[PDB]
Design an enzyme around this catalytic site. Sequence first.
Site, PDB file in Angstrom:
ATOM      1  N   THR A  81       4.866  45.097  87.746  1.00 44.28           N
ATOM      2  CA  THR A  81       6.113  45.534  88.359  1.00 44.28           C
ATOM      3  C   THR A  81       6.316  47.027  88.132  1.00 44.28           C
ATOM      4  OG1 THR A  81       7.113  43.350  88.066  1.00 44.28           O
ATOM      5  CG2 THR A  81       8.597  45.216  88.407  1.00 44.28           C
ATOM      6  N   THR A  82       6.603  47.752  89.209  1.00 47.78           N
ATOM      7  CA  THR A  82       6.791  49.190  89.119  1.00 47.78           C
ATOM      8  C   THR A  82       8.115  49.524  88.433  1.00 47.78           C
ATOM      9  OG1 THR A  82       6.760  51.256  90.386  1.00 47.78           O
ATOM     10  CG2 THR A  82       7.939  49.385  91.341  1.00 47.78           C
TER      11      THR A  82
END
Lengths: 244, 72, 250, 252, 85, 243, 109, 139
Positions: free
Chosen positions: A31-32
């Site tokens: 997840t960024t």
Amino acid sequence: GTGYDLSNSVFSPDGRNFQVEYAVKAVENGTTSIGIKCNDGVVFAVEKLITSKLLVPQKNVKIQVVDRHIGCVYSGLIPDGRHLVNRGREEAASFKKLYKTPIPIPAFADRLGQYVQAHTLYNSVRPFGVSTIFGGVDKNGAHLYMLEPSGSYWGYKGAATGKGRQSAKAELEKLVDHHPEGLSAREAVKQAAKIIYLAHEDNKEKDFELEISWCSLSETNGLHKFVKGDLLQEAIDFAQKEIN
Amino acid sequence: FDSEKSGDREVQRTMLELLNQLDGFSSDDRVKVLAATNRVDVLDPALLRSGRLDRKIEFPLPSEDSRAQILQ
Amino acid sequence: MTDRYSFSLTTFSPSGKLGQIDYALTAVKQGVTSLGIKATNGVVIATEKKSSSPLAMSETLSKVSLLTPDIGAVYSGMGPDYRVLVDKSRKVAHTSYKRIYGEYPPTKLLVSEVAKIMQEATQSGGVRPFGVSLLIAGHDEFNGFSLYQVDPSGSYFPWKATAIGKGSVAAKTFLEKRWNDELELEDAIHIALLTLKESVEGEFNGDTIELAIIGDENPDLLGYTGIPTDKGPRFRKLTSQEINDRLEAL
Amino acid sequence: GEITFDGIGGLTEQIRELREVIELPLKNPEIFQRVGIKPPKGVLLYGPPGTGKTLLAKAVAATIGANFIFSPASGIVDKYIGESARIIREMFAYAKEHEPCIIFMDEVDAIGGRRFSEGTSADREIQRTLMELLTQMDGFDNLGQTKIIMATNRPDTLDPALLRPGRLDRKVEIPLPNEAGRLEIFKIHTAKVKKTGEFDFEAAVKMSDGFNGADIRNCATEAGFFAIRDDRDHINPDDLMKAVRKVAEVKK
Amino acid sequence: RDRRERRLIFGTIASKMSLAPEADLDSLIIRNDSLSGAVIAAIMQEAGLRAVRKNRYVILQSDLEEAYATQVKTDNTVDKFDFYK
Amino acid sequence: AGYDRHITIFSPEGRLYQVEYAFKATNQTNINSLAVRGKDCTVVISQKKVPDKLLDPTTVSYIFCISRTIGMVVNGPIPDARNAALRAKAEAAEFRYKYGYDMPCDVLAKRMANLSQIYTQRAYMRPLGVILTFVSVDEELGPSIYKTDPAGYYVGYKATATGPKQQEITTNLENHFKKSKIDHINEESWEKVVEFAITHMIDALGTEFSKNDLEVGVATKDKFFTLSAENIEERLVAIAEQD
Amino acid sequence: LDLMSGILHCEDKDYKTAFSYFFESFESYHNLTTHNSYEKACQVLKYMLLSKIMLNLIDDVKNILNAKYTKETYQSRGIDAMKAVAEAYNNRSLLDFNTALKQYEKELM
Amino acid sequence: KDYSQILKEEFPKIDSLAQNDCNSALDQLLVLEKKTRQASDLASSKEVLAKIVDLLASRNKWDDLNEQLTLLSKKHGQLKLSIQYMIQKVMEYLKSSKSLDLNTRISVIETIRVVTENKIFVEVERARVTKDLVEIKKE
């Protein structure tokens, strides 16, 4: 003679460790996370992968904290990012033990950096495949640093990593020219929500959950706080109208 | 990258002649070259260009509603 | 912290030898060409300073070191492997010796402790052996002047005159060319300058050539007077001006 | 040749050198006889395979107009009687009988290479080709007007005996072209593609890094499928930026 | 190689080629070290090629320095001159 | 089999392959830095590359501060740089703990030489991919330059260089010193020494840089500091006049 | 060793390589300073000019006296006698060939 | 912010000019040029910086203008090719003038370091003023 990637101490003929390059690939699969560096404080924002409706909002938060004056966020594997914060939190009490003062940002920057560079030397241990983004406010100001799995970090006016870092880095550079002096903490929350929705194009297969937290001087007085109340509601409706 | 191609020597010149024949006639688009494999591991600047493999179309596993349409 | 390799990297080759030692002799024979000669009244030690750049000052690097000033030394082989031997040999000759016997060790006793230290990293696991070859020569109150040739395997050998380095193949004949029991300390210097000059492809002068001899006890290099028992150090390192003065007498 | 010297642009640093060592001695060899020198025989052009290699092959013969002799490395190594011997000898004789002939070799690493221990197990065809190329050049019969171009993956993996002077005098690297050289390339392949007059040619040059005529055709493939969706016979200048950006991620 | 042993090639190969009195062959001897027969012969050959590039039938001093930088360094490798580690 | 390039052992050619590959990692950043010495002082200049516009020029430094006197210049990745930076700052502090006076210049190069050997001699530690360069003013020999390679070797240098272009920088520094027949540059004020190193740097490189593209270290007598962004800009304007 | 060898290349002609034996000594004895006298260094320079006259190159002889790097300030009567022989080779006349014979006979003969 | 930079040029150009056009102009170049000069960002050089030369012309003796022109190409500047365009223009004012400018055209060639030394990859202007010097020596 192959096998250069079977050990951390083995160097390639070009002088680049393969295990370090594979650690970057693990960041692109996670997840960024983004970040904003203001004058009197710093702002952190990260999204969450929603598998189904069983997830309870505002419970499991990937944003960590160091004492009350420093927040932390990572993009990558869950156990790698959380274990690195525990080492910094245990050593933060040792700094207040001897020096009695709260640990500043430059003292906390070299705190986490010595551990990541140590795992690359010993082939018997696995380095952290996560990108750590930390920041806060100290006596000299507010600083924002971005740690890399290779142990490389410097000053960043903005922090973008993860899968959606390609579209996130373009928006952070535009905010510098639009606000060369500084940016308020309330507006930075609304601007960080629009960056999250920009990287959501690849995440459209599932839902999304936004978790934003920031620490400043003139507002939180060096305290790590999460965005709640009407501040979070107004920030969501502002970014959803601009993205579509 | 290795020098162990002595056993793959027949495989080595197979890809070399593939690049040579595709450069022979550039005016014929009616000859298609399709390769169905499991995945992509070793890249090449020669393999990506016109008249060769360009668009990579992933074939993932079918989703919930995808298996329902296939079985129907 | 918790070293997980305890196994020795040196194993017996199928031909009946040790590969790590046999391959260590390659760097010794390809190293810097040096030489030494033991006379009756003293010991001469000469080497060549090879700089990869003309802007590198050769006065900082000393290819002839000092452990205790009864004995000279020179390295035909890896420098870092030689530097750690300097700190450890001085420790066993002072902390483990001068703090017990209250004196300085002879030549035969010094090579015994250095040979054991070189094997420590050879047998131990997770560490690389020493591929450096040393030449240790000094004076004794009974056996007199004695020279030894230390191999990277850890087995020293005594020699009257020996030369090791890149040109060591042709240098051994030059030391065996003119030799006798009547040689002096200065007479072996002129032979050392002509032999080493064969291996010098660059400039030849007092700056690029390090010459050190072992003479009698020098009161000028001592630093105090009034004590007859100590007349000063035997080892003396020649300067750049003294080396060039002996070149015109060749 | 079908590819002129205006589509190989960006190599102009090498182009100025290649034309003087190839085009100049071939058209007027008599200028060297007065001084007494000799022109080089072979020209070694290495680099990444597939990028600019096909263009430079036809570009040398285009500015000349001579015969283009292509030598694929697959047919060189076979199992027959006198296979690689008759290939080089007859090509050596065909180059002497017919002066306007240009020989181009592609991927000589298969027929070349140092291997490992320099031993031969089913390797006799590798040394069979290499030894014949070096023997024909140093013999009493040389090639005055004949040029031979070789290509491989790496120059260091070849035979050092060929790289020495007296046979191969030309070793030239093929790096990525500059920004000012890729503008002339983008005005050729895109000229065949139907577009409008408002198409911007400066949109790609900023986002393009080492993109020759082979890589820009992939951008025209994506732009050709877009004209059907919007019911248009041309493309907008924004299609060039989106197509090059997608290629820049996979390429350098 | 030696200073005279290399000069034997300069005084020979260049004797069959047209040169100029301004060009000096002594600068190409001492500065060059450990070169084969064809490398030194290529210096006189490349000097004639560069003269034709400028359309010159002789060999000047400037053409020698331009052809000198090509054949002077045959070693692009690093990690050499290592007596240590 | 391939254990010669995996772990450090004696090779048939007598070379350590694992350690030699660490030298090629020094040129990944492509930083060419030279070190020159004045009369009573020493001035070093290193290149600074800022690819991202979000980088903070104050935080990025290729020249660290070991103490109020001895400085350090490192070319390579920061993780291997901080490994030698934590030891250099600690060993400089441990000296005055057991002694009480300031560590000389040649001493720190020797302390870091045996430590870099631990990486090369021991198989479980990989050698550093950085090169150490220490410049300071000694209380006896005055200005001195000690450049510690990852091999663990140290020797005196007049004017050194690093990076892929070090061959071009060295050639410029050779022709200048042979005419004056002196190792260092003789000048009273230390501000003129900064202009002297930039002159030899531009001719060897062939390009110009801005205040944010360069980092100029200055080691004076019994004092050490680093020029800020406004001080480096003043040096580029001052050198623009006259020569 | 090259001076004794260069003499063996005299009666055998092939003066192209014979100049290298004589030129090798000129720079060799030049660095010897006191080890070479004025008369000994003058005879060595006469060997180089004599080898070029047998090789019949006028331009290489003029470059020896004109250029200070080649000359190194060495001049005498016998050295000037080689210049008169080179000038008589262009006009091809024995008058100038025997002109320097009688005047320079002391050093020349 | 966009066009505001070029508006501050003509403001001092109007009110009062006595002898001060040299200091009131060239000093403005030091404040700007810091973060500017990317592609189209130029508000001064190649456009207004050339107008400053037009302001200094027809003011005092050309010896003072010839010395101040060197200082522009001395410290920093931008591109020597843009300076070469102004040098070609100065030669036009000196050609239509003549009179005492016959010896002035010679001093401009030797004073400017662009003609004497190499500066930018385009030397075309260096040989243009050199041909005019040959015509003077032949007469």
